[PDB]
């Protein structure tokens, strides 16, 4: 059934699984028309499909042309997310196909289930976890490849960079969710924490800075403080 | 007007005939039901006074043979049997009528209720849902499971309703996932009407038979089937106008007949709210919407 705090270790076992987040598929700016009505203009989006064990990210870029002359776009966006995940699974060799797909939003269940009818042994699960994958587009290199796309494109990343060389997938996921939670709560302050020190760079082939083990502890502490500092403002507590 | 004689009533029982019912006392000199209207199916049904567990009954058509009821003290129920000897049967019925040992099917001349509930129900379709080809009449009870309930355990005792499943390859054409899921017209019109039922009359027969089994036996699988066949039409954008008009009439008489006190168990909130207020056909069921709003406003 639902993935929660109770069954959290299951994310790091040897059963292939993928998180699917559809938050950034259909993205708009709302603006005024010359007549003083309101209109939306779509921008490029992405499906965020992540193997939490390996860090492998299947970033499917959703080009604005998808939406041209379509109606009920927030509804279509769930079905298009499901079409593209189903197509990804069918493209993978059998031994690479997931056993489970966990959707971060319950509205993706029926669309994904219907598109995956050909795969009755792949479980489609919701989660009770509130994962911060919406903040994916706060990661500069992911944001850049999405906005520059001129056509539908699939880009493959490791969202853990080379972390699994030094830490477990449990710890790598904890680090990723803390970074994304911070970027989601206060993007400016999170980016300042990550790039404030000029001597620490991001490798051409990486998403995040090249931090030593001790620098990661400091960064992780600064991220926790940011999230509490911000929660201190929100609620005045 | 045909007759179903009873050998005797050795156990205290509530006897149903169609929408009517009578309490019979233990060893009361009851010998059956006369004046049963020719031209419809009928259902004769039972609920023992000493064990209300297992409502059970028999669907029959008096045109297909001479049928009687006899209590079996071994299996502990009223059984239907066919009398093949025409002259023995007529002779038995004539005797019981003379001694006025039979209740009269109590049909008011103005009242089309039974016709309206069974308009599309045919014995030959019942005998394919309820498989026991040695008998011309069909046994149903409270506890019998459907083929679909059994998939999700004795095949011989199943209700073989047509399986309907909105998240099945049968319901969803490869490459038309969103279209077929949001608009079930393909599934209704091509798969079910043209494909399996052949026509709207057979589809309505099964819908009406599922309802009556749900109402008279509290058969939960039957109730699921009735709701599924309503939802499949209401969730289709493209339905022939004659089918919508007929559905409105069918559902109106089902809601009209339903005991007021069973609406909590026999009506599915989600299906009715969706069908009347959100679906493609929300504005196509005027009679059904007015009786539901006036009789069961809490459900909605």
Swiss-Prot record, chain A:
Segments for region (RNase H homology domain): 7-237
Localization: Nucleus
Residues making up the signal peptide according to the UniProt record: none
UniProt effect for mutating residue 22 to A: Reduced growth at 30 degrees Celsius. Strongly reduced growth at 16 degrees Celsius. Strongly reduced growth at 35 degrees Celsius
Membrane-spanning parts: none
Function: Functions as a scaffold that mediates the ordered assembly of spliceosomal proteins and snRNAs. Required for association of BRR2 with the spliceosomal U5 snRNP, and the subsequent assembly of the U4/U6-U5 tri-snRNP complex. Functions as a scaffold that positions spliceosomal U2, U5 and U6 snRNAs at splice sites on pre-mRNA substrates, so that splicing can occur. Interacts with both the 5' and the 3' splice site, as well as the branch region. Has a role in branch site-3' splice site selection. Associates with the branch site-3' splice 3'-exon region. Also has a role in cell cycle.
Domain notes: The MPN (JAB/Mov34) domain has structural similarity with deubiquitinating enzymes, but lacks the residues that would bind the catalytic metal ion. Contains a region with structural similarity to reverse transcriptase, presenting the classical thumb, fingers and palm architecture, but lacks enzyme activity, since the essential metal-binding residues are not conserved.
Subunit note: Component of the U4/U6-U5 tri-snRNP complex composed of the U4, U6 and U5 snRNAs and at least PRP3, PRP4, PRP6, PRP8, PRP18, PRP31, PRP38, SNU13, SNU23, SNU66, SNU114, SPP381, SMB1, SMD1, SMD2, SMD3, SMX2, SMX3, LSM2, LSM3, LSM4, LSM5, LSM6, LSM7, LSM8, BRR2 and DIB1.
Other remarks in the entry: Present with 468 molecules/cell in log phase SD medium.
Protein name, per record: Pre-mRNA-splicing factor 8
Species name: Saccharomyces cerevisiae (strain ATCC 204508 / S288c) (Baker's yeast)
Whole-protein residues included: 1836 to 2069 of 2413
From Swiss-Prot, chain B:
Phosphothreonine: residues carrying this PTM: 257
Protein name: A1 cistron-splicing factor AAR2
Gene3D superfamilies in the cross-refs: 2.60.34.20, Aar2, C-terminal domain-like
Function of the molecule: Component of the U5 snRNP complex that is required for spliceosome assembly and for pre-mRNA splicing. Involved in splicing pre-mRNA of the A1 cistron and other genes that are important for cell growth.
Record text on subunit structure and interactions: Heterodimer. Interacts with PRP8 (via RNase H homology domain and MPN domain), competing with BRR2 for the same binding site. Component of a U5 snRNP complex that contains at least the U5 snRNA, PRP8, SNU114, AAR2, SMB1, SMD1, SMD2, SMD3, SME1, SMX2 and SMX3, but is not a component of the U4/U6-U5 tri-snRNP complex.
Region (Leucine-zipper): 244-265
Modified residues (Phosphoserine): 236
Leftover remarks: Present with 7330 molecules/cell in log phase SD medium.
Post-translational changes noted in the entry: Phosphorylated on serine and tyrosine residues.
Primary location: cytoplasm
Localization annotation: Cytoplasm; Nucleus
InterPro entries named in the record: AAR2, AAR2_C, AAR2_C_sf, Aar2_N, AAR2_N_sf
One Pfam entry name: AAR2
Cellular compartments per GO CC: cytoplasm; U5 snRNP
């Amino acid at each position: 059934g639902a993935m929660n705090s109770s069954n959290y270790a299951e994310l790091f076992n040897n059963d292939i699984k993928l998180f699917v987040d559809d938050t950034n598929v259909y993205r708009v700016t709302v603006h005024k028309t010359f007549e003083g009505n309101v209109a939306t203009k779509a921008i490029n989006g992405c499906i965020f499909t992540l193997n939490p064990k390996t860090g492998h990210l299947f970033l499917k870029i959703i080009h604005t042309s998808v939406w041209a002359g379509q109606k009920r776009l927030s509804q279509l966006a769930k079905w298009k997310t499901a079409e593209e995940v189903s197509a990804l699974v069918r493209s993978l060799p059998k031994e690479e196909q997931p056993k489970q797909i966990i959707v971060t939003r319950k509205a993706m269940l029926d669309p994904l289930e219907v598109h995956m009818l050909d795969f009755p042994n792949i479980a489609i699960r919701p989660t009770e976890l509130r994962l911060p994958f919406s903040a994916a587009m706060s990661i500069d290199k992911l944001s850049d490849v999405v906005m520059k796309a001129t056509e539908p494109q699939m880009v493959l990343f490791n969202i853990y960079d080379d972390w699994l060389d030094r830490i477990s997938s449990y710890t790598a996921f904890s680090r990723l969710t803390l970074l994304l939670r911070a970027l989601k709560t206060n993007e400016e302050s999170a980016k300042m924490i990550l790039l404030s020190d000029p001597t620490i760079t991001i490798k051409s082939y990486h998403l995040w800075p090249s931090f030593t083990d001790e620098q990661w502890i400091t960064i992780e502490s600064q991220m926790r403080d940011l999230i509490l500092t911000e929660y201190g403002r929100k609620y005045n507590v | 007007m045909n007759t179903v004689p009873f050998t005797s009533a050795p156990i205290e029982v509530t006897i149903g005939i169609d929408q009517y019912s009578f309490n019979v006392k233990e060893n009361q000199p009851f010998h059956g039901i006369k004046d049963i209207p020719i031209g419809h199916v009928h259902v004769i049904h039972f609920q023992h006074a000493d064990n209300s567990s297992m409502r059970y009954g028999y669907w029959f058509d008096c045109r297909m043979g001479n049928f009687y009821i006899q209590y079996d003290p071994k299996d502990g129920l009223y059984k239907m049997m066919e009398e093949r000897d025409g002259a023995k049967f007529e002779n038995i019925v004539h005797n019981f009528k003379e001694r006025q040992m039979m209740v009269s099917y109590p049909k008011i001349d103005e009242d089309d209720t039974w016709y309206n509930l069974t308009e599309f129900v045919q014995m030959d379709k019942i005998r394919k849902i309820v498989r026991k080809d040695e008998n011309q009449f069909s046994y149903v009870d409270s506890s019998m499971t459907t083929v679909q309930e059994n998939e999700l355990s004795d095949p011989a005792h199943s209700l073989n309703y047509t399986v309907i499943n909105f998240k099945s390859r049968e319901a969803i054409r490869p490459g038309h996932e969103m279209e077929d899921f949001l608009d079930k017209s393909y599934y209704l019109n091509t798969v079910m009407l043209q494909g399996i039922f052949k026509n709207s009359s057979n589809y309505f027969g099964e819908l009406q038979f599922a309802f009556l089994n749900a109402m008279f036996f509290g058969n939960y699988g039957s109730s699921l089937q009735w709701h599924a066949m309503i939802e499949l039409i209401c969730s289709s954008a493209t339905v022939p106008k004659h089918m919508l008009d007929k559905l409105d009439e069918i559902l109106y008489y089902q809601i009209k007949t339903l005991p007021e006190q069973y609406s909590d168990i026999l009506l599915n909130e989600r299906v009715w709210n969706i069908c009347l207020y959100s679906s493609f056909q929300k504005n196509s069921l005027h009679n059904t919407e007015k009786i539901m709003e006036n009789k069961y406003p809490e459900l909605l």
